């Protein structure tokens, strides 16, 4: 399809027992990190129950230790039923709006309003339309329509005749009508009328006739975030700003009205509130002004749960000239719990490389897998995973059916790992541009 293979495509979930929250040593694409995956499983329970508001969890650990992997596992195990918002901290630095507005919008995207609405909908194959134009048009008309089970004629009002002539409905068209509003959508064309469609090229697809009742009360479930309600109410076609993104700094009295309106709908039972989760990757890229905002944005009943990831040691907080653990001020870290991810053992590296090789289309000999595992221990899990693709392409060019040690060794020779590339810049120092800007171009 459209969706290609990416770094995380193998992650299908958290790999955890739904009864006990015990993580399995490998399942759903996640290997190891068991203490961290158990803690992430407890956080999913908090999210799905919705009771607790504005918890902030930090996933802290070295690079390539599965902090994003666990975050993808949580997103995949919540599924489409819950708002999950994936923010890179670099995105808050908009030119369109202030940092705190961008953080408000991110929080507001992460609470859903869930609304259930019925419509009668009419769906069937068109047997016939006649229309009388006299000559101004649309004076009267009749629709005959069927399913495999039922056939009816309808007398049409003139605005339905305008809908029919707008959407060029003809005999054989399979249509649905949202009769609460009278938009008509041409679901397709019946195969039984294929020869009527003289203007349709050979690439044209055809459906079978619809089934059952011509009219059904379909029930639709909508989830709309608080941010969408905010943006709708910002200008005459404010919803367009959900796509073009040119929302200004939306005024807070609009949001306060909406908060009141949604609490009204909750108590009336017209709607339900669905608290989601905001994920902030590389949270250390936020500055001291962002953190002091987030402190108190977490205190609302309409706060999502927040989940954050950091690679950083004791490091300088942005927007100040002093250093703190994770790169985050202690003022903020007081309201956070930390989940820590560890480095992998060799058998965990072997398993992750195997899963990555099976998610890719790669037939991998046992000695190539052993070599890639040793490279993993010495050069890191990402570099070994990047060599899988490379070795497959080398093996394919020599027409080989399997990736052998020979192909991994070409890959290892052609593409340096970070440690070898660091050595390369240290040995090549006079030929590279140094931090003083000096370089020598001569032989």
């Amino acid at each position: 399809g459209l969706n290609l293979i990416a770094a995380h495509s193998h992650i299908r979930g958290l790999g955890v027992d739904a009864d006990t929250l015990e993580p399995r040593p490998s399942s759903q694409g996640l290997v190891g990190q068991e203490k961290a995956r158990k803690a992430a499983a407890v956080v999913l329970e908090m999210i799905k129950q919705g009771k607790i508001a504005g918890r902030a969890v930090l996933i802290a650990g070295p690079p390539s230790t599965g902090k994003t992997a666990i975050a993808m596992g949580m997103a995949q195990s919540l599924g489409q039923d819950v708002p999950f918002t994936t923010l890179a901290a670099s995105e808050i630095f908009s030119l369109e709006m202030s940092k705190t507005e961008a953080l408000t919008q991110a929080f507001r995207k992460s609470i859903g309003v869930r609304i259930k609405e019925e419509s009668e909908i009419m769906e069937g194959e068109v047997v016939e339309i006649q229309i009388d134009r006299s000559t101004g048009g649309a004076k009267q008309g009749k629709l005959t329509i069927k399913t495999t089970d039922m056939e009816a004629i309808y007398d049409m009002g003139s605005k339905m005749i305008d809908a029919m002539t707008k959407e060029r409905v003809m005999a054989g068209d399979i249509i649905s009508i949202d009769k609460s509003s009278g938009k008509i959508t041409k679901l397709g064309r019946s195969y039984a009328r294929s020869r009527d469609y003289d203007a349709m090229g050979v690439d044209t697809k055809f459906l079978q006739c619809p089934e059952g009742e011509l009219q059904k009360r379909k029930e639709v479930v909508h989830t709309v975030s608080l941010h969408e309600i905010d943006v709708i109410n910002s200008r005459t076609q404010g919803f367009l700003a959900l796509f073009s993104g040119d929302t200004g700094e939306i005024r807070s009295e609009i949001r306060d009205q909406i908060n009141t309106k949604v609490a009204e709908w909750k108590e009336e039972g017209k709607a339900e509130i669905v608290p989601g989760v905001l994920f902030i990757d590389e949270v250390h890229m936020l500055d001291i002004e962002c953190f002091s905002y987030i402190n108190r944005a977490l205190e609302s009943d309409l706060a999502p749960i927040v989940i954050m990831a950091s690679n950083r040691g004791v490091s300088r907080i942005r927007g100040t000239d002093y250093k703190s653990p994770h790169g985050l001020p202690l003022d903020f870290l007081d309201r956070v719990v930390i989940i820590n991810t560890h480095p992998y053992t060799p058998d965990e590296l072997r398993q992750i490389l195997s899963i990555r090789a099976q998610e890719e289309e790669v037939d991998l000999t046992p000695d190539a897998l052993a070599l890639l595992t040793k490279i993993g221990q010495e050069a890191g899990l990402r570099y070994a995973s990047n060599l899988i693709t490379t070795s497959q392409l080398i093996a394919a060019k020599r027409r080989a059916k399997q990736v052998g040690v020979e192909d991994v060794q070409r890959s290892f020779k052609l593409f340096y790992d970070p440690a070898r590339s660091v050595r390369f810049v240290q040995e090549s120092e006079k030929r590279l541009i140094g931090n003083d800007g000096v370089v020598d171009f001569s032989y």
Binding site: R133, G137, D162, T165, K166, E167, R168, M170, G172, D173, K186, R189, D196, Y197, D198, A199, M200, V220, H222, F239, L242, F243
Partner: protein, 140 residues
């Protein structure tokens, strides 16, 4: 004025036609057996006032549209192993690219729904053009 054509059996068909008692079915021998049955005077020896055919093989070069077509069509030879098709399809763009696919009134890609006509025949002479143009991004 051109009896010899592609090959010699294709000459025998003309000789058999005139004398099927003689001809039925080493090249230097031919000139000595055709001599009773053929006569060919030639315009250097005859009508000398008709000065020779001045000739210019021009060796002109492709335009940008042609080579864009040509390369996409020449790529098919690399994919091969169909020249019985392609030599003519190449020759078509050698002559003019509108023979291959004619240039026409054009516009950007339209990223939207509209109701297309299913039948030209059943439309008739009088028709109402409604405004069907609609976004495929469809916020519910």
């Amino acid at each position: 004025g051109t009896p010899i054509q592609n090959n010699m059996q294709e000459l025998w068909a003309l000789l058999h036609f005139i004398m099927p008692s003689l001809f039925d079915s080493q090249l230097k021998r031919l000139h000595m057996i055709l001599k009773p049955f053929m006569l060919r005077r030639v315009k250097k020896h005859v009508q000398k006032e008709l000065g020779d055919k001045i000739e210019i093989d021009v060796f002109c070069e492709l335009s940008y549209r042609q080579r864009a077509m040509y390369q996409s069509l020449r790529n098919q030879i690399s994919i091969m192993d169909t020249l019985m098709n392609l030599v003519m399809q190449f020759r078509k763009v050698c002559n003019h690219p509108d023979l291959f696919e004619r240039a026409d009134t054009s516009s950007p890609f339209f990223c939207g729904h509209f109701a297309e006509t299913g039948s030209f025949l059943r439309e008739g002479t009088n028709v109402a053009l409604g405004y069907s143009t609609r976004s495929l991004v469809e916020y519910r």
